[PDB]
Amino acid sequence: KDGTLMNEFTTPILQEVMENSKIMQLGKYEPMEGTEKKFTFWADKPGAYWVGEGQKIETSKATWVNATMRAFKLGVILPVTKEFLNYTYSQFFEEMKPMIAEAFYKKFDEAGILNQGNNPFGKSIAQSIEKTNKVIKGDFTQDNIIDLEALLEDDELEANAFISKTQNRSLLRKIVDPETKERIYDRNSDSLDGLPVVNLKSSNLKRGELITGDFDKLIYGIPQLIEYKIDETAQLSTVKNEDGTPVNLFEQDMVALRATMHVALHIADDKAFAK
Amino acid sequence: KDGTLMNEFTTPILQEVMENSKIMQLGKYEPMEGTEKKFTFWADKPGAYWVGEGQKIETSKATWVNATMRAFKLGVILPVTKEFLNYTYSQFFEEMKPMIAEAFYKKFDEAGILNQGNNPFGKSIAQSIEKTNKVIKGDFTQDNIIDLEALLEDDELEANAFISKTQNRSLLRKIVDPETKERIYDRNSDSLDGLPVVNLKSSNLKRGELITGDFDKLIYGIPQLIEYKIDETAQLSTVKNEDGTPVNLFEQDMVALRATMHVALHIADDKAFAK
Amino acid sequence: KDGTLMNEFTTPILQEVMENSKIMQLGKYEPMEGTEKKFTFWADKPGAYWVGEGQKIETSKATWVNATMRAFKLGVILPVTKEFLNYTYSQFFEEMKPMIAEAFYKKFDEAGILNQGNNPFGKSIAQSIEKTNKVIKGDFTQDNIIDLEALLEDDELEANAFISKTQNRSLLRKIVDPETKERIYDRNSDSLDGLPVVNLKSSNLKRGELITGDFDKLIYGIPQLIEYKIDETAQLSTVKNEDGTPVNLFEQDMVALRATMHVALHIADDKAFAK
DSSP: OOOOOOOOOOOHHHHHHHHHHHHHHOOOSOOSSSOOOOOOOOOOOOOSSSOOOOOOOOOOOOOOOOOOOOOOOHHHHTTHHHHHHOHHHHHHHHHHHHHHHHHHHHHHHHHHHOSSOOSSSSOTHHHHHHHSOOOEESOOOHHHHHHHHHHHHHSSSOOOEEEEOHHHHHHHHHOOOSSOOOSOSSSSOOOSSSSOEEEOOOSSOOSSOEEEOOOOEEEOOOOEEOOSOOOOOOOOSSSOOOSSOSSSOOOSOEEOOOEEEOOOSOOBOEEOOOO | OOOOOOOOOOOHHHHHHHHHHHHHHOOOSOOSSSOOOOOOOOOOOOOSSSOOOOOOOOOOOOOOOOOOOOOOOHHHHTTHHHHHHOHHHHHHHHHHHHHHHHHHHHHHHHHHHOSSOOSSSSOTHHHHHHHSOOOEESOOOHHHHHHHHHHHHHSSSOOOEEEEOHHHHHHHHHOOOSSOOOSOSSSSOOOSSSSOEEEOOOSSOOSSOEEEOOOOEEEOOOOEEOOSOOOOOOOOSSSOOOSSOSSSOOOSOEEOOOEEEOOOSOOBOEEOOOO | OOOOOOOOOOOHHHHHHHHHHHHHHOOOSOOSSSOOOOOOOOOOOOOSSSOOOOOOOOOOOOOOOOOOOOOOOHHHHTTHHHHHHOHHHHHHHHHHHHHHHHHHHHHHHHHHHOSSOOSSSSOTHHHHHHHSOOOEESOOOHHHHHHHHHHHHHSSSOOOEEEEOHHHHHHHHHOOOSSOOOSOSSSSOOOSSSSOEEEOOOSSOOSSOEEEOOOOEEEOOOOEEOOSOOOOOOOOSSSOOOSSOSSSOOOSOEEOOOEEEOOOSOOBOEEOOOO
């Protein structure tokens, strides 16, 4: 029962999502340990005659929270016996070692970009929106896009790239100004004010494009190694009983990964409101 | 306590039983997967004048049930510490890897030949005797042997080789015809009608020789590999407690084996009856 | 939390204690198996005229009890994750493989020398003091040292070397005769009668120097090997639960060691008494 050999092919959507997630982060200068901290604040005070003005700047803030990749899989447990007997299932498991690692990289970037997704807690757009008021409620408009861009530009510096989902892109392309084309209307990516927007995969976000300022990304690197003892959910196919076993049966190779993201001071956000 | 080094020698009876079990099966053309099926049936219908006779033959039957070899042993668990310390016990365990594999091959052939032995269920003589009436009850006789051979020859084809146990061979050699020698009486194996009988090890069978028609045998091949985590019965010698351990202590190397036997249409059988 | 990298240096006291423990034993001719036994007893009987004197000597006594080194450590379990990430903790664990093995060698010699320390039970000074009266109660004195030496010399042979602790050495150096210097008074080790005393680490002994006769030492040799499944005490740092796990998490490499000590007939002992 349930013993058949079949060839499996990798999906094209997973490869496109992995490239989109890497471009959305835009990290610079990767470090092994979380030691880097911003100290600049700039203090200045003016007088008129015979006055002693005091100026001092001191700050320390470092974020370090590693996210581990998935080890043993419940679906791979049934395929473990198929991998030993058939060459087709063994080749599929080898391709899965690179497929799941890209998916783990995509989920790490999603946790910082979206407030609902939690993995590191207190990084990128998720920490910026809760601490400082930047997100605007309502429908997307050409006049509203110019107003939202001005508020983001006022906080220290101006935004370079904006992350947008495919579902949000459809609503953005539909909206157009009376005289100006604004939303694409040719071949290139649509721009709200001037700068081009980059595509990013999102599950929590549905409507509205969010822009990110400056954020550094650092990762150790995803590796693949076979493991004999690993904690997994109980599963039975034929003539087997499982209740508290982890060392007796191996399902999938344990992947080790460590990635850390630097927290941003201010980030632009947009969300649709319904009443 | 219980710590002594001694040299062990392999028994001659196990080697003879392994060769007898391989000859008794008489398998032809081994396959990796159970895909082969018999389709021939032969249909024929005769008439006289202006008649439309319909003839069609279609059949599909494939048997596939793999039998796994024994892994960790309870007797080898006490010998595991002796193998690490002494070279004599380690050499005995290496010889046991080939000895138990031959015993596993002998048990697989016994399951098809004898109805009581179950491993695959629904193969060779065990499936033929239950589905079709072929076995005869009573004492072995020269006139009875000729009558039993005629019934086996009527079903499709004639029998080539008959499997016989050592206990059944003693009763067979004692019986002899009034004019003809019949049972050996020289040097070669005893024949009931004409064709020679092959020796086979049997635990369930006691009296009466059983003949097998055509049956194909296919096996992947017995291998030996060391294992750290394997489910075994609890055992304690000195200063140890066991209740639910499989990964902590290793007893014997886990042997992997897969063998499948093709089901036969008709097979001759003989058994003694008592009242 | 609790994640910092720091360089660790080996202590000088552990190296000095290891050399002192090896010198205190003074074992000769090492054997793999406990088969050696003393048979000599010497029997003699004298007469005068027409007398038949019978003389016979037969004896058999062999001691064999192996002591195993420590495997997984509770302190190393927290350092296991630090060893994989940082090179400083991994180098400290490699040095610990040789440090703990020397400590295990020191504890084995302490079990025979001191009655309180049990590992083998029935070896060296621990078996000699309980079976035969040799230990003297009271304060250490120059006249008492000469009296204690005479009792030890009477039993078969004379003592060659005496084991002394650092705490007992301070009291021994303070005591001195009216005319003779006795206790060191130059540079070399202090002698009670003539022969020099060797330093040995002791936890049970506090006052009084004990002398050992003849005792053979035999050991297989300490080795280091990595283990996946080993029984250890439950420990948790962050987001982990432990109750009955040994195979899932590895703390330290399992060291295998076997050492045996030959029992002595008579050994000198000294202890202080308080009323």
